[PDB]
Design a protein around this nucleic acid. Structure first.
Ligand SMILES: [Zn+2]
Ligand SMILES: [Zn+2]
Lengths: 50, 78, 50, 99, 107, 209, 199, 49, 50
DNA sequence: TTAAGTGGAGCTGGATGCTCTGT
DNA sequence: TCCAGCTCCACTTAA
RNA sequence: ACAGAG
């Protein structure tokens, strides 16, 4: 994302099992590294590095 | 004996919390003492931390045999 | 009037901070004109919309 | 010791300190520290002040004397190579034609 | 070689007669007896090159030297710069570093 | 020439020695290390040397199994080997009561004889190798990991450890050159020892199909 | 003229960005449609939907690409040992010599819980410990350190200091990081392969 | 339906299906594409199929 | 636009939204800020229990 | 002399990125 | 706009 | 069917 007129989508899951498969497997705290080469993606960016 | 892994995988953890949250969403008895919680998933995770969930995970090998592991005897982790 | 600086951290990727007391005084004020038309035809039968 | 670069806080690769916290102290300690950084770094940077200007890209006097000499030497050696191709022998590099 | 009939100007063919080989037209009686040696030399292009290559000087006739790579820091280097992807608003570089023959190639 | 032609008759003979040593046939140690200058001794250059029937190998017996389990190696002289030369080798093989034979063709085989080598007999199995494939031992190549043909008592322990069938293994074809090197038929299992980036080794298995 | 040439060099970047999208998405669609069935079973094999085996162990090692703390490897022993020496300095314990280190390392590694690991990981641990012990001997040969603990400038025991508590925590941390780095059964490993090659 | 003018609703396309497989999310991939789009039941004769 | 790609493997869903995005660093890395105009439309069916 | 098995050449049918936002 | 299968036709071996 | 946007 780049905040220049960017549209993102949303989905509210409608089942308790659809919640718990989304929280345990798909959360941001459980997806910090990319599955490709194990490098972290959620980290600091410009003005947090500067 | 049982030869499969002793660590609970993320898929077992996710589906046990899901099925336990769907049971607590219906009027099932709760094995822990809740302290004001309303979301069923949070009560499921409190039951998971205290090792009280009455689910037996049956693991099917690809030949057809199985192994019945308890939730309270798999090593939980993050 | 533009100051070029790093301010408040809501301006990371192309986002820009505005002034609340400039938008109130008339800056950025736009108007949107739309349309709504309706036709009332006469038929081959001697009858008509109304 | 040492300042914090892109290769220590940023999203590039390993030896990230948040990756160290992820692998040694759990998920939740890597997530709190990024929120503390996201909270703390604009408070410092927006009260230090940090700005760019046309004077931040203007060439000094040391550059304008170097650039003239470099352009003259480069254009002269290119002209000598032009004359050496068109009017005689060029030391033809291996694998390629004279052009 | 093409040779053409003085009469009708069709193309002659070589055939054999009772005393000589003849150039003969296909459409008129004209024939020309080959009395003496006649020739046509092609002189094709020989394979002029031998083309040995890959020398180290043929590798390092590019600008960069005594810079810094993020892997092994050696001076003898071979750099590259690209920009031809405008989804990449940052620049693009690739570097080769061969003083100790370490041979890195990264971004 | 004649420095490079006798080179081929040396190198092909050396590779056939190694191919017979890897199939469990009895090969002496000196034939596996027969030097080029020593190959000059028992056969000189092409005016003194003779190509087609002087370099045959019929000494090869299965020292694991049995001394009557024997195998020919023939070097035909014409480049495209017709049916007639195959019939000559087959009647010679009929005379000596041998069941297995190899044929090293020089340029190719006529398409009615490639059809012949399949359907002459199930008891008379014959293998066509080009002489250009035998100029290098493909097992010595660095892209080819070491294959080992497995016994039935090892296939049975393989299929009991993972609880499999035969048709769930990965496959190797019989037209595979490394399969034709070992001479393996449908229903055998090979063990492939793959080298790793580390000092470790990963073992895997393929069924001939 | 320079502006026109620089615009020529920029439109190539724009057109490569624009062509890149239809250039790659069909490839990723093919990879996903061909690889979406593969799964890591509970018997450490990778099978298709029909039951045939694609791999006997996943990747050779049985391990997860998302959990590699090194260059395609599960640990990096220098960093782990430095972490354990920094988190647990044991100031009231004697620093081990070479042979005492080898003795306590082979003493811990023959317990019951280390048998679950692969053999190559245990060989790499023993190789690393032998390297550390040779560093200890190369230091204690230079500075005249006697292994009994009685040389008077006691700063010399700060040079390659290693205690039995740090060795125990080291081996437990390495073993726990190896056992949690395995590919968990049920992982849609073909879809991860397809995305990590198509991206 | 399709768009914002028709109160449409968004699209789990072909590519976003491929991401939910990679997480191993089975019931979420069931809930998005069956329960909350077009769930339905039919009467099936088990004899003639 | 057939059945298999257009209506079976991928299909339009409800309980979904779509908006322009904008940054906010005062949130955590695992939170998201939903506007109230979308939070009233989107619903989660919560079962009544004790 | 010709029956036949297999090469090479031309014809045919398939495919070519993800969404919203409007007329 | 690019690329695998299918079918037609000369070209040797073999009797 | 065309134009946009990321
Ligand atoms: Zn004429
Ligand atoms: Zn380098």
């Amino acid at each position: 994302a780049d905040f220049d007129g960017d549209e993102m989508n949303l989905h509210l899951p409608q089942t308790e099992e659809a919640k718990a498969e989304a929280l345990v497997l798909m959360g941001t705290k459980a997806n910090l590294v990319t599955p490709r080469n194990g490098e972290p993606l959620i980290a600091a960016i410009q003005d947090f590095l500067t | 004996k049982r030869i499969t892994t002793p660590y609970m995988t993320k898929y077992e953890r996710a589906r046990v919390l899901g099925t336990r949250a769907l049971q607590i969403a219906m009027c099932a008895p709760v094995m822990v003492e809740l302290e004001g919680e309303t979301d069923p998933l949070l009560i499921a995770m409190k039951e998971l931390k205290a090792r009280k969930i009455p689910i037996i995970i049956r693991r099917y090998l690809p030949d057809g045999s199985y192994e019945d592991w308890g939730v309270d005897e798999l090593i939980i982790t993050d | 009037t533009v100051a070029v600086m790093s301010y408040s951290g809501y301006d990371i990727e192309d986002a820009l901070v505005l002034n609340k007391a400039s938008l109130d005084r008339g800056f950025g004020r736009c108007l949107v004109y739309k349309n709504a038309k309706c036709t009332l035809k006469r038929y081959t039968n001697q009858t008509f919309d109304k | 010791s040492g300042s914090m670069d892109k290769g220590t806080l940023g999203s590039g690769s390993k030896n990230n300190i948040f990756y160290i916290l992820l692998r040694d102290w759990g998920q939740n300690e890597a997530a709190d520290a990024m929120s503390r950084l996201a909270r703390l770094a604009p408070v410092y940077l927006s009260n230090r002040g940090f700005s760019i200007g046309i004077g931040d890209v203007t060439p000094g006097q040391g550059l304008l004397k170097a650039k003239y000499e470099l352009l003259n030497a480069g254009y002269k050696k290119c002209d000598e190579y032009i004359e050496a191709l068109n009017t005689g022998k060029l030391q033809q590099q291996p694998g390629c034609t004279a052009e | 070689m093409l040779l053409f009939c003085p009469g009708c100007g069709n193309g002659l063919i070589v055939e054999e007669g009772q005393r000589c080989h003849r150039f003969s037209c296909n459409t008129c009686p004209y024939v020309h007896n080959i009395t003496r040696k006649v020739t046509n030399r092609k002189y094709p292009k020989l394979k002029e090159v031998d083309d040995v290559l890959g020398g180290a000087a043929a590798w390092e006739n590019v600008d960069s030297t005594a810079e810094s790579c993020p892997k092994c820091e050696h001076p003898r280097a071979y750099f590259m710069q690209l920009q031809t992807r405008s989804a990449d608003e940052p620049m693009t570089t690739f570097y080769k570093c061969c003083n100790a023959q370490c041979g890195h190639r990264w971004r | 020439d004649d420095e490079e032609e006798t080179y081929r008759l040396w190198k092909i003979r050396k590779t056939i020695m190694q191919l017979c040593h890897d199939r469990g046939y009895l090969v002496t140690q000196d034939e596996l290390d027969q030097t080029l200058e020593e190959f000059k001794a028992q056969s000189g250059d092409k005016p003194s040397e003779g190509r087609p029937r002087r370099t045959d190998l019929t000494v090869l017996v299965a020292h694991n199994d049995d001394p009557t389990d024997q195998m020919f190696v023939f070097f035909p002289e014409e480049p495209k080997v017709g049916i007639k030369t195959i019939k000559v080798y087959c009647q010679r093989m009929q005379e000596e009561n041998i069941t297995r034979a190899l044929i090293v063709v020089q340029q190719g085989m006529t398409p009615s004889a490639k059809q012949s080598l399949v359907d002459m007999a199930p008891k008379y199995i014959l293998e066509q190798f080009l002489q250009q494939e035998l100029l290098i031992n493909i097992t010595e190549h660095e892209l080819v990991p070491e294959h080992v043909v497995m016994t039935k008592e090892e296939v049975t322990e393989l299929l009991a450890r993972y609880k499999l069938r035969e048709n769930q293994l990965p496959r190797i074809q019989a037209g595979d050159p490394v399969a034709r090197y070992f001479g393996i038929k449908r229903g055998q299992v090979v063990k492939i020892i793959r080298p790793s980036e580390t000092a470790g080794r990963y073992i895997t298995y393929r069924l001939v199909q | 003229t320079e502006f026109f040439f620089h615009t020529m060099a920029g439109r190539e970047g724009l057109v490569d960005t624009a062509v890149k999208t239809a250039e790659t998405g069909y490839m990723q669609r093919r990879l996903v449609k061909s690889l979406e069935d593969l799964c890591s079973q509970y018997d450490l094999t990778v099978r298709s939907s029909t039951g045939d085996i694609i791999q006997f162990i996943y990747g050779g090692d049985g391990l997860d690409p998302a959990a590699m703390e090194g260059k395609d490897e599960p640990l990096e022993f220098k960093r782990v040992l430095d972490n354990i020496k920094a988190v647990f300095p044991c100031p009231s314990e004697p620093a081990l010599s070479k042979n005492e280190l080898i003795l306590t390392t082979e003493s811990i590694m023959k317990k019951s819980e280390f048998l679950c690991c692969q053999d190559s990981f245990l060989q790499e641990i023993k190789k690393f410990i032998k390297g550390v012990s040779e560093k200890i001997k190369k230091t204690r040969d230079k500075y005249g350190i006697n292994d009994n603990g009685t040389t008077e400038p006691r700063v010399l025991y700060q040079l390659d200091r290693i205690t039995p508590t740090q060795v125990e925590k080291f081996l437990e941390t390495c073993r726990d990081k190896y056992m949690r780095a395995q590919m968990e059964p049920g992982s849609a490993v073909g879809a991860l392969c397809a995305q990590s090659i198509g991206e | 339906t399709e768009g914002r003018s028709r109160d449409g609703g968004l699209r789990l396309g072909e590519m976003e299906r491929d991401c939910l497989i990679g997480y191993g999310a089975s019931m979420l991939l069931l809930e998005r594409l069956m329960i909350s789009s077009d769930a339905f039941e039919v009467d099936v004769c088990g004899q003639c199929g | 636009q057939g059945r298999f790609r257009g209506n079976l493997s991928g299909k339009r869903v409800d309980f979904s939204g779509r908006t322009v995005i904008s940054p906010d660093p005062n949130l955590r890395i695992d939170e998201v800020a939903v506007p109230v105009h979308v939070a009233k439309i989107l619903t989660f069916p919560e079962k009544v229990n004790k």
